[PDB]
Design a binder for these strands. Structure first.
Ligand SMILES: Cc1cn([C@H]2C[C@H](O)[C@@H](COP(=O)(O)O)O2)c(=O)[nH]c1=O
Ligand SMILES: Cc1cn([C@H]2C[C@H](O)[C@@H](COP(=O)(O)O)O2)c(=O)[nH]c1=O
Lengths: 318, 318
DNA sequence: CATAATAACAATA
DNA sequence: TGATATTGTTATTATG
DNA sequence: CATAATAACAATA
DNA sequence: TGATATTGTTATTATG
């Protein structure tokens, strides 16, 4: 197996961070680079294990989620440097207990949310704002609007979404479009990777397609197109966060802060409330419109956080 | 660790089967008994492994579910004979691949069902039948009725259910009772084991409680009380199956045969349709009324098989 | 004298 | 079923 | 001459 | 997160 290699992306991030006007020192990226460095020439399991042990000792005062993420970074770096067949990939990993605990906590949270939904009182107002954003000229705004109206992830919307009209009968669908470029998915049998599939929209198709075309033809939209996730995050995450904070501050449910993904949650809820066929379940429908894998009904549980004032009403009926 | 022991239950089942007027030969129970026999005196891992290998070779032309079940029987027998700390418990197990495949298939099935629900057209008729069964004098019938009206498992209903009135305000609840004696659960932190909890009923509480009291005071009901699962199965499973076949044959959804558990599914569906508070989800509610563990929302997915004609209607609205 | 900028830190799906 | 890819939030750094 | 009875076999949650 | 407890269905056996 390869004994030498370089994690190019890490080295490039580190190099670009040399001439920075301000900001944190890239200590983590540096530890990873030095890690991949020390790995060069290693042929003994125990040495590798000692190196990894050192790194694990380092990130001691961190959150479990944080440590798990960092381990992801290290593993991706090792994989980029030496390939998939390097023994370090068997060593550079967290306790099974850590992952089990993460799963546990996740389930507890989700179940807590299912036990006490948040009534989205002013949801129509939010949807309306998102629709007005489709007419805005600032591509950030068009983006937010498309998130609210299509329930696509930010990364998807800005950097890689392919929207096309959805053919209904022998014309075009008024309330659905064709989305391609699903994120967070590897190539596989039951995945939506590279799969163009029909999703519902919360306004006219023509509107969404027009706005998307505009955003996509904007200079900033051309900058966004094909971006990596890190590039997109560093480029836009805070601006998008602050903007979404600003737009929905007055009309968002008081139990939580306005977040971009909340538009995806709410999109799922509303789309189900308006378009769901009579023979599928809420989980199945969510899984369908969100682009989850086939036979995956467990991820849909993550998106059931709100209840509509109407449902709340005709449940109080009772 | 213990080198000798006896699987008493297996030996007793085998002994009682000696003087049988008819029926299959207990070949499996015999293989298990001979297994536990051969284990007596074994102190070498490789010997144990060879024995287990022999047994695995035996059940070769079986279904995966079957093999998994049999392995459960063997493991329970070993555990009963030698205790929890016997090395064989590390050997007597199936491939991880077998279990993974079982999980896979299960998820595929469940998702298929969520994709294509069965419209329970004549559900009110079924519920009515179940209500009439509460007035019947045959404790089998009272039992079926209580299954339909409380959504308790057969084993629970007949052998171990403790129903009491549910106090509403300062009177009694009309539409809910207190159930104790949840099955398929070990003692634990988030389990309903030994936990008395409030479940909804699909008729008046008084009715259900009266019928349950009658069934419980019947001679057959006194025979049922405290029975093991095997005893109950051999005593009643076929009669219950044939009877439920008979009662609902005309009015059951044409896509499937009338089965006892279908009353539990339908119970969950209807109970949600009638009593669900405005701030919980369908999964959470199911999990609540069915007695599933806290933070367990995945088992509830198993019970979403039907859709009501009404929901089908006001989904076609659309 | 103090803020924008950056990546660490962290949580979600 | 092994151990990721996104989104969300805070402490630290350089800069007339 | 043929059926009730039993446990194997199998699937579900 | 390791490897169960129920419910549902079929082949085999003993019996004037
Ligand atoms: C979608 C999803 C994925 N995962 C997976 C993705 C990673 O492959 C895995 C951790 O390794 O967790 C969850 O734990 N929860 C989820 O909701
Ligand atoms: C309730 C439930 C349990 N299980 C568990 C129970 C057993 O402990 C385990 C197999 O070992 O499977 C499922 O696989 N699916 C379910 O729906």
């Amino acid at each position: 197996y390869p004994k030498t290699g370089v994690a190019t992306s890490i080295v490039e991030k580190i190099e670009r961070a040399e001439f920075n006007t301000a900001g944190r020192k890239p200590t983590v990226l540096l530890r990873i680079a030095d890690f991949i460095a020390a790995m060069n020439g290693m042929d003994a399991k125990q040495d590798m294990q000692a190196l990894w042990d050192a790194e694990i000792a380092i990130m001691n005062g961190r959150a479990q989620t944080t440590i798990i993420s960092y381990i992801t970074k290290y593993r991706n770096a090792i994989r980029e440097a030496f390939g998939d067949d390097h023994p370090m990939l068997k060593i550079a990993t967290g306790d099974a207990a850590m992952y089990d605990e993460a799963r546990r906590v996740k389930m507890e949270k989700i179940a807590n949310k299912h036990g006490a939904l948040i009534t989205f009182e002013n949801y129509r107002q939010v949807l309306k704002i998102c629709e007005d954003c489709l007419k805005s000229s600032d591509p950030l705004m068009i983006g937010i609007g498309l998130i609210g109206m299509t329930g696509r992830r930010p990364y998807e919307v800005f950097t890689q979404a392919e929207f096309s009209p959805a053919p209904y009968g022998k014309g075009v669908s008024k309330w659905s479009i064709l989305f391609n470029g699903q994120a967070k998915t590897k190539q596989g049998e039951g995945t939506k990777f590279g799969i163009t599939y029909e999703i519902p929209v919360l306004t006219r198709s023509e509107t969404v397609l027009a706005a998307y075309k505009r955003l996509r033809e904007s200079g900033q939209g051309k900058l966004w197109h094909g971006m990596s996730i890190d590039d997109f995050s560093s480029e836009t995450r805070l601006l998008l966060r602050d903007t979404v904070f600003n737009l929905f501050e007055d009309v968002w449910p008081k139990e939580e802060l306005p977040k971009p993904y909340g538009l995806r949650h709410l999109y799922a809820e509303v789309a189900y409330h308006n378009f769901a066929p009579p023979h599928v379940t809420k989980n199945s429908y969510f899984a369908a419109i969100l682009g989850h894998n086939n036979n995956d009904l467990e991820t849909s549980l993550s998106y059931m956080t709100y209840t509509l004032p109407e449902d709340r009403d005709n449940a109080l009926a009772r």
